[PDB]
Structures are given as structure tokens and as C-alpha cells.
Design an enzyme around this catalytic site. Structure first.
Site, mmCIF file in Angstrom:
data_model
loop_
_atom_site.group_PDB
_atom_site.id
_atom_site.type_symbol
_atom_site.label_atom_id
_atom_site.label_comp_id
_atom_site.label_asym_id
_atom_site.label_seq_id
_atom_site.Cartn_x
_atom_site.Cartn_y
_atom_site.Cartn_z
ATOM 1 C CD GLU A 171 -2.892 -1.220 2.298
ATOM 2 O OE1 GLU A 171 -2.702 -0.410 3.234
ATOM 3 O OE2 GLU A 171 -3.700 -2.176 2.369
ATOM 4 N N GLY A 172 1.953 1.242 -0.727
ATOM 5 C CA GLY A 172 2.842 2.386 -0.835
ATOM 6 C C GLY A 172 3.607 2.749 0.423
ATOM 7 C CE1 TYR A 210 -10.743 1.219 38.012
ATOM 8 C CE2 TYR A 210 -12.760 0.031 38.165
ATOM 9 C CZ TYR A 210 -11.550 0.227 37.575
ATOM 10 O OH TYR A 210 -11.156 -0.580 36.545
ATOM 11 C CB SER A 238 -6.903 -7.131 29.251
ATOM 12 O OG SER A 238 -6.442 -8.150 30.128
ATOM 13 N N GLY A 239 -5.054 -5.047 31.437
ATOM 14 C CA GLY A 239 -5.023 -4.340 32.712
ATOM 15 C C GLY A 239 -4.974 -5.186 33.978
ATOM 16 C CG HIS A 280 -2.439 -3.988 42.548
ATOM 17 N ND1 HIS A 280 -3.090 -3.542 43.654
ATOM 18 C CD2 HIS A 280 -3.418 -4.464 41.676
ATOM 19 C CE1 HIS A 280 -4.417 -3.736 43.494
ATOM 20 N NE2 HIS A 280 -4.618 -4.283 42.278
ATOM 21 C CB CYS A 333 -5.740 -6.728 39.968
ATOM 22 S SG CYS A 333 -5.762 -5.560 38.575
ATOM 23 C CG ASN A 350 -6.421 -7.122 45.184
ATOM 24 O OD1 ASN A 350 -6.198 -6.654 44.052
ATOM 25 N ND2 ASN A 350 -7.491 -6.804 45.881
HETATM 26 C C1 LIG Z 1 -7.836 -4.966 38.036
HETATM 27 O O1 LIG Z 1 -8.466 -5.414 38.997
HETATM 28 C C2 LIG Z 1 -8.369 -3.937 37.050
HETATM 29 C C3 LIG Z 1 -9.580 -4.529 36.308
HETATM 30 N N1 LIG Z 1 -9.179 -5.866 35.873
HETATM 31 C C4 LIG Z 1 -9.657 -6.209 34.761
HETATM 32 C C5 LIG Z 1 -9.376 -7.538 34.200
HETATM 33 O O2 LIG Z 1 -9.308 -8.521 34.973
HETATM 34 O O3 LIG Z 1 -9.191 -7.673 32.967
HETATM 35 C C6 LIG Z 1 -10.465 -5.108 34.139
HETATM 36 S S1 LIG Z 1 -12.211 -5.278 34.416
HETATM 37 C C7 LIG Z 1 -12.877 -6.637 33.487
HETATM 38 C C8 LIG Z 1 -12.207 -6.850 32.128
HETATM 39 N N2 LIG Z 1 -13.284 -6.856 31.158
HETATM 40 C C9 LIG Z 1 -14.550 -6.394 31.685
HETATM 41 C C10 LIG Z 1 -14.943 -5.033 31.160
HETATM 42 O O4 LIG Z 1 -16.087 -4.633 31.329
HETATM 43 N N3 LIG Z 1 -14.021 -4.302 30.514
HETATM 44 C C11 LIG Z 1 -13.136 -3.362 31.199
HETATM 45 C C12 LIG Z 1 -13.825 -4.370 29.067
HETATM 46 C C13 LIG Z 1 -14.358 -6.368 33.200
HETATM 47 C C14 LIG Z 1 -9.993 -3.920 34.960
HETATM 48 C C15 LIG Z 1 -8.894 -3.153 34.231
HETATM 49 C C16 LIG Z 1 -8.651 -2.626 37.795
HETATM 50 C C17 LIG Z 1 -9.782 -2.712 38.821
HETATM 51 O O5 LIG Z 1 -7.461 -2.224 38.484
#
Ligand SMILES: *C(=O)[C@@H]([C@@H]1N=C(C(=O)O)[C@@H](S[C@@H]2CN[C@H](C(=O)N(C)C)C2)[C@@H]1C)[C@@H](C)O
Length: 268
Positions: A95-96, A178, A191-192, A196, A214, A216
Site C-alpha cells: 500500500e505504498g 473508580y 487488558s489491565g 499489586h 487483579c 491483590n
Molecule cells: C484490576 O483489577 C483492574 C480490572 N481488571 C480487569 C481484568 O481482569 O481484565 C479489568 S475489568 C474486566 C475486564 N473486562 C470487563 C470489562 O467490562 N471491561 C473493562 C472491558 C471487566 C480492569 C482493568 C482494575 C480494577 O485495576
């Protein structure tokens, strides 16, 4: 060197991870991320040369149109040296779009560090080269928001970070908005999901799942993890009521069966 004509609208630069000279864990894939979507993914692959010592078979798989990964079938053997030559200068990427430059990185594999978070015991156990070095009580995702099972690669580490629900498009002063200050956060999924510090759940850690997904752990255990776990180390989650972590998460690569990974997915 042979000069290639170019225009800032038709050039794309590769970015390689991990960094030159870094020592990483046994789960670290080689990642080449381009600053634009790539149309000719086969051409990009052909442009990238990965050599290992001791030599091990590996293969490319695309996480998305911008980013390709390379790994072996099994976790890296500690001590392995890896050289990556991304010879994209003047390569037609379709695509260039053309490769802007060549990049060359070199890295090494450190100790085998594998932490298992077992939802049956609610203990996170860290093994270094097969030996248990640490046990930490943990609290994982509650039943409505479970932590996914699977193999997670350790990414970035933060002494402090903000967990803001609006970046997930769900605002604060909301159903579940939050904004939360968190210490000693080690990222294990794009995905987060993080390991922690969670002073608010210390009583539940080792007994009951209370988090949004997460891992914890106590303030001191979280600081421990931050200090002793590096990029590329492995967190394995087992026995949760969740599904499996997506292989294309960003840190989920090991969850893709080898036959699918090796076959690849490159539009050539
Ligand atoms: C960790 O606790 C953080 C949360 N953890 C997440 C995870 O386990 O992926 C997400 S919430 C979860 C992922 N998909 C659903 C949603 O509705 N979306 C966000 C798309 C719920 C979240 C980052 C946070 C509380 O620190």
C-alpha cells in the site's frame, strides 16, 4: 548501503523489544511493532532475522496489524543470547508504505522465574529455577469478574499507578467508576491485570477472591514482586472460574497452541 528515496507520508519505522543489552525472563517474546498498520505482513517477516545461541526453533505470529512476535515452542532456556536484525530499510510493506530504517537489538535470557497463582489455595508461589523462593497470600477476581486462567508474561512495573475506569469507558461517579491509587504494580496483561499492593483486601488474601481481576497481595509482598520479578518472567494462573487469557492480549502469547503459532497468520 544503497540509498532509498522516501516521503514522510509513506514511511513506517519499526520498534523492537526488548531493549538492546537487556536481560529478560524465559517468557519474553521478541516484539517488532511498527508505527503504522502493515499491509504486506509476509514481507515484514521476511525482513526480520532472528538468531539464537544456543539455537532454538521459533516462529512469527502477528498480534494485530502493527505488531509481530517471535518465540520458541517452550520457554527460553536461561543463558540464551538472542540477536534481532530488522532489515526493513527500503522494504516495500505494501500500500505504498516503505520501511524507514534498519534496527538491530541483542538481549539475553536470565533465570527461570515462574510464579503460580493457584485459586484453590489463594497462594501465589514464586519459583526461581525450580526452587520456591516466596509464597504470598493473594486475592483474585470475584466470581462476577474472575481472573482469567493461563500463562501471563510480566511487562511493565510501577512504583505507583492510577487505575481509572473511564479509560475503560466507564466513568467515575458512576456505576463502577473508580479512580484508584495503587502502589507496587506489576503488569501481567495489556487488558489491565496487575499484581499489586492492596491494603484494603489483606484480610481476604489467602481466603477469598474480592478484586476486579487483579492479583491483590500485601504491600510488602507487592514491593517484593516489583523488586524481584523482571520483564519476561511468567505468572501462571490456575483453577479460577474464569476462562483462558486471550493469546493476542499483548502478554498472552504462550496461550496460543504451538501448531497455530508456528503456522502463523501473515498476509503475504
Ligand atoms: C484490576 O483489577 C483492574 C480490572 N481488571 C480487569 C481484568 O481482569 O481484565 C479489568 S475489568 C474486566 C475486564 N473486562 C470487563 C470489562 O467490562 N471491561 C473493562 C472491558 C471487566 C480492569 C482493568 C482494575 C480494577 O485495576
Amino acid at each position: 548501503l544503497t540509498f532509498q528515496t522516501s516521503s514522510p507520508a509513506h514511511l513506517t519505522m519499526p520498534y523492537v523489544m526488548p531493549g538492546d543489552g537487556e536481560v529478560v525472563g524465559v517468557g519474553e517474546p521478541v516484539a517488532i511493532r511498527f508505527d503504522e498498520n502493515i499491509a504486506d505482513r509476509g514481507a515484514a517477516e521476511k525482513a526480520i532475522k532472528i538468531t539464537t545461541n544456543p539455537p532454538v526453533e521459533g516462529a512469527f505470529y502477528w498480534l494485530n496489524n502493527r505488531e509481530v512476535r517471535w518465540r520458541p515452542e517452550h520457554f527460553w532456556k536461561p543463558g540464551t543470547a538472542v540477536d534481532v536484525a530488522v532489515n526493513t530499510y527500503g522494504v516495500d510493506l505494501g500500500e505504498g508504505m516503505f520501511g524507514e530504517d534498519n534496527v538491530q537489538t541483542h538481549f539475553t535470557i536470565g533465570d527461570e522465574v515462574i510464579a503460580t497463582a493457584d485459586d484453590n489455595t489463594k497462594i501465589l508461589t514464586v519459583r526461581v529455577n525450580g526452587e520456591v523462593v516466596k509464597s504470598m497470600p493473594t486475592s483474585m477476581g470475584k466470581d462476577s469478574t474472575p481472573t482469567a486462567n493461563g500463562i501471563y508474561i510480566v511487562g511493565s512495573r510501577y512504583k505507583h499507578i492510577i487505575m481509572d475506569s473511564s479509560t475503560y469507558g466507564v466513568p467515575v461517579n458512576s456505576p463502577n467508576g473508580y479512580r484508584t491509587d495503587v502502589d507496587w504494580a506489576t503488569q501481567i496483561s495489556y487488558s489491565g491485570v496487575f499484581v499489586h499492593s492492596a491494603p484494603w483486601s489483606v484480610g481476604a488474601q489467602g481466603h477469598t477472591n474480592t478484586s476486579h481481576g487483579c492479583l491483590n497481595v500485601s504491600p510488602s509482598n507487592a514491593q517484593w514482586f516489583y523488586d524481584h520479578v523482571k520483564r519476561g518472567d511468567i505468572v501462571e494462573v490456575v483453577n479460577t472460574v474464569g476462562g483462558t487469557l486471550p493469546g493476542i492480549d499483548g502478554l498472552g502469547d504462550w496461550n496460543i497452541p504451538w501448531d497455530q503459532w508456528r503456522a502463523g497468520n501473515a498476509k503475504a
